Design a protein around this ligand. Structure first.
Ligand SMILES: [Zn+2]
Length: 134
DNA sequence: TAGGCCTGGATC
DNA sequence: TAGGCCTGGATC
């Protein structure tokens, strides 16, 4: 749905990858054995991305803010386990794969490349670049 | 299909 | 992690 926009590039570089595995925490979306790393395509809302696509609903605010918080909490945990199992994690938010700021289809491959292969601490890819996971 | 709203939903 | 609605475009 958005997983594709990114998935399409993966095979674009051949990169050996499996999909949505429920045997790995946070059930990654893309799993790559070619580097012992997993990727995530998190929607900006459910996971509270401090990006333009995040808007606290005006209804049942407290019910959504608390539900969301538990999500972030679950990601933190998820990532942490993955890292424990010798996995490198990368998060690519939607705000940088769909929307009025979405990385030009170039910048991605160009950024995914320097990552996936050329090693590097876990990190996240957003509309304004890629930074250490944190 | 482009995004912009509005809510929960289905599962496990 | 949505799907249902509604707008406004590009493709044909
Ligand atoms: Zn975002």
């Amino acid at each position: 749905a958005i997983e594709k926009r990114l998935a399409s590039l993966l095979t674009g570089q051949g990169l050996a990858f499996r999909v949505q595995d429920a045997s790995l925490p946070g059930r990654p979306d893309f799993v790559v054995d070619e580097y012992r790393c997993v990727i995530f395509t998190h929607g900006c809302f459910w996971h509270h991305h401090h990006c333009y696509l995040f808007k606290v609903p005006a209804t049942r605010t407290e019910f959504w803010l608390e539900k969301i918080g538990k999500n972030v909490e679950r990601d933190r945990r998820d990532i942490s386990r993955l890292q424990e199992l010798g996995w490198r994690v990368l998060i690519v938010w939607e705000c940088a794969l769909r929307g009025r700021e979405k990385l030009t289809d170039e910048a991605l491959t160009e950024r995914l490349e320097e990552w996936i292969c050329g090693e590097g601490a876990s990190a996240q890819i957003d509309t304004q670049g890629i930074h250490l996971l944190a």
